[PDB]
Amino acid sequence: RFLKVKNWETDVVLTDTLHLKSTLETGCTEHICMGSIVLPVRTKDQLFPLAKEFLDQYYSSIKRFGSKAHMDRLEEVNKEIESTSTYQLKDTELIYGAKHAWRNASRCVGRIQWSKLQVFDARDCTTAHGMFNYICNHVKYATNKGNLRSAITIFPQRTDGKHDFRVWNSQLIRYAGYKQPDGSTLGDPANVQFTEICIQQGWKAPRGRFDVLPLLLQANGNDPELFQIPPELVLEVPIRHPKFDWFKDLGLKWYGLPAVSNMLLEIGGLEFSACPFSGWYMGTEIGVRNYCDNSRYNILEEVAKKMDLDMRKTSSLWKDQALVEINIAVLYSFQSDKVTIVDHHSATESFIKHMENEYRCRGGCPADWVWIVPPMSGSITPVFHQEMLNYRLTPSFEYQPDPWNTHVWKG
Amino acid sequence: RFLKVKNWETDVVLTDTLHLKSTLETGCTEHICMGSIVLPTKDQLFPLAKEFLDQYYSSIKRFGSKAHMDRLEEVNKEIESTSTYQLKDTELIYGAKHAWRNASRCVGRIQWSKLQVFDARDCTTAHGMFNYICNHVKYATNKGNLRSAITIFPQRTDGKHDFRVWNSQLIRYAGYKQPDGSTLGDPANVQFTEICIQQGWKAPRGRFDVLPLLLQANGNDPELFQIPPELVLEVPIRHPKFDWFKDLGLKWYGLPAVSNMLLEIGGLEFSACPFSGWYMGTEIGVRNYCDNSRYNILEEVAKKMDLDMRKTSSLWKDQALVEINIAVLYSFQSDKVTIVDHHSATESFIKHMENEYRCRGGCPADWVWIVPPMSGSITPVFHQEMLNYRLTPSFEYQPDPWNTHVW
Ligand code: HEM
Ligand code: HEM
Ligand SMILES: N=C(NCCC[C@H](N)C(=O)N[C@@H](CCN)C(N)=O)N[N+](=O)[O-]
Ligand SMILES: N=C(NCCC[C@H](N)C(=O)N[C@@H](CCN)C(N)=O)N[N+](=O)[O-]
Ligand SMILES: C[C@H](O)[C@H](O)[C@H]1CNc2nc(N)[nH]c(=O)c2N1
Ligand SMILES: C[C@H](O)[C@H](O)[C@H]1CNc2nc(N)[nH]c(=O)c2N1
Ligand SMILES: OC[C@@H](O)[C@@H](O)[C@H](O)[C@H](O)CO
Ligand SMILES: OC[C@@H](O)[C@@H](O)[C@H](O)[C@H](O)CO
Ligand SMILES: [Zn+2]
Numbered sequence: 077r078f079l080k081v082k083n084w085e086t087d088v089v090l091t092d093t094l095h096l097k098s099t100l101e102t103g104c105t106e107h108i109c110m111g112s113i114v115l116p117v118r119t120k121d122q123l124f125p126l127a128k129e130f131l132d133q134y135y136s137s138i139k140r141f142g143s144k145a146h147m148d149r150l151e152e153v154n155k156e157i158e159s160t161s162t163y164q165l166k167d168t169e170l171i172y173g174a175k176h177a178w179r180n181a182s183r184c185v186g187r188i189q190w191s192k193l194q195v196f197d198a199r200d201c202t203t204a205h206g207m208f209n210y211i212c213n214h215v216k217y218a219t220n221k222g223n224l225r226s227a228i229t230i231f232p233q234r235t236d237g238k239h240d241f242r243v244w245n246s247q248l249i250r251y252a253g254y255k256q257p258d259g260s261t262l263g264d265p266a267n268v269q270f271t272e273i274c275i276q277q278g279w280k281a282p283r284g285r286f287d288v289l290p291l292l293l294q295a296n297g298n299d300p301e302l303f304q305i306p307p308e309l310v311l312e313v314p315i316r317h318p319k320f321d322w323f324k325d326l327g328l329k330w331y332g333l334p335a336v337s338n339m340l341l342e343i344g345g346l347e348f349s350a351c352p353f354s355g356w357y358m359g360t361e362i363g364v365r366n367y368c369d370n371s372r373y374n375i376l377e378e379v380a381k382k383m384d385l386d387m388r389k390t391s392s393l394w395k396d397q398a399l400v401e402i403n404i405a406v407l408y409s410f411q412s413d414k415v416t417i418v419d420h421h422s423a424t425e426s427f428i429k430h431m432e433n434e435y436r437c438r439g440g441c442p443a444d445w446v447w448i449v450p451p452m453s454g455s456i457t458p459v460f461h462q463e464m465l466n467y468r469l470t471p472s473f474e475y476q477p478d479p480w481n482t483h484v485w486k487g
Numbered sequence: 488r489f490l491k492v493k494n495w496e497t498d499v500v501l502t503d504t505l506h507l508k509s510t511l512e513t514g515c516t517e518h519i520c521m522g523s524i525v526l527p528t529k530d531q532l533f534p535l536a537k538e539f540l541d542q543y544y545s546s547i548k549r550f551g552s553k554a555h556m557d558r559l560e561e562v563n564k565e566i567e568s569t570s571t572y573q574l575k576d577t578e579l580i581y582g583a584k585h586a587w588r589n590a591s592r593c594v595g596r597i598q599w600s601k602l603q604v605f606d607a608r609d610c611t612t613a614h615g616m617f618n619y620i621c622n623h624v625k626y627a628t629n630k631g632n633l634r635s636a637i638t639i640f641p642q643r644t645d646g647k648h649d650f651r652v653w654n655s656q657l658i659r660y661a662g663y664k665q666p667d668g669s670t671l672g673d674p675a676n677v678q679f680t681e682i683c684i685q686q687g688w689k690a691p692r693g694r695f696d697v698l699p700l701l702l703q704a705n706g707n708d709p710e711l712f713q714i715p716p717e718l719v720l721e722v723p724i725r726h727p728k729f730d731w732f733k734d735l736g737l738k739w740y741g742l743p744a745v746s747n748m749l750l751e752i753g754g755l756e757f758s759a760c761p762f763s764g765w766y767m768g769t770e771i772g773v774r775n776y777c778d779n780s781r782y783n784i785l786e787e788v789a790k791k792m793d794l795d796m797r798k799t800s801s802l803w804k805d806q807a808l809v810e811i812n813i814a815v816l817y818s819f820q821s822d823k824v825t826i827v828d829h830h831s832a833t834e835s836f837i838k839h840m841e842n843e844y845r846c847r848g849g850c851p852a853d854w855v856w857i858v859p860p861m862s863g864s865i866t867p868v869f870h871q872e873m874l875n876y877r878l879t880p881s882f883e884y885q886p887d888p889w890n891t892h893v894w
Binding site: 079081082084085095098101102103104105106107108109110111112113114359364365368369370371376390391392393395396397399400403404407408411419421422425444445446449450451452453454455456460461462463464465466467 | 490492493495496506509512513514515516517518519520521522523524525768773774777778779780785799800801802804805806808809812813816820828830831853854855858859860861862863864865869870871872873874875876
């Protein structure tokens, strides 16, 4: 089959054939679309075909499909599965697998960078202290004093499901959130529950508005352990505005390294439950969502007051005006401190070029419009005008339940 | 079976059962989502009519009544005999209001029950169509205090006698390709404009020429008519702080009136059913004025504001965008012409959604279209999960007539 997508601004039409390789379900049906829904131990039986599909993809990528090396590897893996019920990936396969999970992430607008991922193999890790050391090294490497480099650290794969490795933090670096008895929230509201867990586990909370959370690490299914990331490895940027000198006095700042640490990486049927990865920020993530969501730092009112905007009626678009200035401040601050960041115009323009290239060399590029289009100025970015097809390819990054809802405590 | 939608800002979860009544397809499958794609017999008729009538009689608390059963048999007899049937005025009004109620891409549905329905099923000629349209425009415009309305022309018979309004909206500006290779006017209307000239219209070749109506009756060739100039309310655009804005010489019409969709009620198809409400600010300021394929005025405005257009990161496009939109809202409000900003419109849709889940068990909604084209996440709909599905009565897309008409 062939499916076409059209760009309504340029009339350019692209043809997709890659969707035929899609196996996983989307959540939609011929009668209902769930395109805006955020969240719509295997057996030997189901494992070898997953392994085979992957190795076939890998060997084709290196132009050795059907070779003796390819056939020997399939045989080697088949024998390993029947013998041990699982199998180990070669270093080359792990790297190829991690890169493709990113290439296949339909919600990621930064995929033009997919082939440049630095992969850290942490499959020899056995304890939480070992995980801490690997993570510190990841943060230092990725941060690179402001010249950010994309990277992923991969811990041991799932075995029987009772020995999982997990990073309990949602991101390696985040700010604590504290619920006050008067019902107000200090810090980042998004992390109140995790913050409470850390405190219960023994963390001594400084109780400020921007406290870097400690790492809570679980190795081999054991109870998680607390570790503080060396302060000198956590790069932060004070936010100020190029024309408004009062902006700095809002006391805002943000960390430079965005590092998702709670997703699961699937490669050839194998499940990597601890696979923290990082790239660099697109400005709106901080300026629009982290600072302006009503449920996050919610700074729109304070900023609009300072700009002395007419806040008597929404039709003056005071919220829209303040939003633009806040985002100008974020980009200006990061750039001033020489910390990598990309604005939404540059990022979306690059994604469109990446998408077109993928359709041509790969036959498609699964993309989730709802997530790709920036949270501000949507229609003045090219992606708003681009029809997209969303489907799931493996290797892939998947959501998994927070560990505190499933962990069997040992005491 | 029972689906749930969550609002990530408030945590409120709603349960949807209404989708179970969905009949038409979405274009998606379990393997691929096409959520961002813009355009994804007597034996057939009676089933559709029954489905509709059952919902109508249920709405009037007379389901399973004798009147319900009588009407059901009356229509059945009529279909078998005439291969079609005629809706009672009450059914037509209910159907039209529900087609709006079911429009998943419309953010202004909290207004659905207040639609004024003009029954033009007795219309027979193109001149008759012109008169009905002039009356709709005058009524809906109401000197600036707009009122929602729909005018319904004769239903499809055999497909060779279809009534059609060739225009995409009752009121739009012409588009002309110039020697410069550039485009004068609205680029979106270049093809239709040429069809009008090809038909006789004397184009004024200006930037904002109100197009004439091309009306088709009983399947005959379409005819041109000029909407009385005095019935077309326009608003000159100026900014409340930038005196130079008025120098851009921009203006827009006050009445948005989609005229090319097909209204389906109880299996019957009404190919000419122009309807109108009022504008959401972003429609004009973001899309019409800033789309690169439309008036594309961002650069001009940025220049007048003296913004640094060297680097995209200065967010000059974003700053100019907000100003253009502040000007549109200010101009309409200053002239007492109805208009709603995206914050107010989206807040009302969320309230409408809650009402609908509580009293109907759901509300089909297309997130891709409901979320405004600017400041997405500072509006509540961005944080609202939605389920998109098709219910009838409905408003459907249909091929432009010039690509199907046999002259
Ligand atoms: C190099 C710079 C990168 C940029 C500019 C970028 C940008 C983005 C942005 C803007 C989002 C949306 C975030 C949100 O709204 O929560 C995102 C999502 C995502 N990115 Fe990227 N990304 C980059 C690197 C990476 C890397 C290194 C990986 C993996 C190896 C990756 C995997 C993903 C995934 C899986 C999602 C969706 C997560 C979810 O569903 O919550 N990205 N990216
Ligand atoms: C009363 C005020 C109304 C408001 C504020 C409103 C607003 C909107 C907006 C902003 C859109 C998107 C337009 C676009 O991006 O092209 C829209 C779409 C739509 N509206 Fe409403 N609307 C109103 C009344 C109506 C009425 C009276 C009807 C029908 C009787 C209606 C039927 C629809 C339909 C079918 C669509 C989607 C059209 C498409 O798919 O292209 N609307 N509306
Ligand atoms: N730019 C990035 N942004 C990551 C954004 C993560 C986002 N702040 C977040 O909280 N994501 C949720 C997922 C929400 N669906 C999580 N990680 O638990 N990633 N990067 O590698 O460069
Ligand atoms: N506010 C309204 N806006 C509708 C605007 C229609 C839009 N400008 C338009 O051109 N739609 C195309 C379809 C868009 N894919 C058409 N009807 O030919 N509607 N109203 O009744 O109040
Ligand atoms: C309900 C809706 O799906 C939700 O708010 C989505 C919309 N688009 C998004 N897009 C990005 N990049 N990130 C998000 O968290 C979201 N949230
Ligand atoms: C390609 C994409 O579907 C297209 O640009 C859509 C997105 N959302 C939209 N939303 C509204 N209200 N109106 C539109 O014309 C569009 N265009
Ligand atoms: O406070 C805990 C939250 O950070 C956590 O529940 C996240 O919402 C979850 O990881 C999904 O992002
Ligand atoms: O110039 C003709 C166009 O306006 C017309 O073909 C529209 O694109 C069509 O009605 C869909 O909006
Ligand atoms: Zn879908």
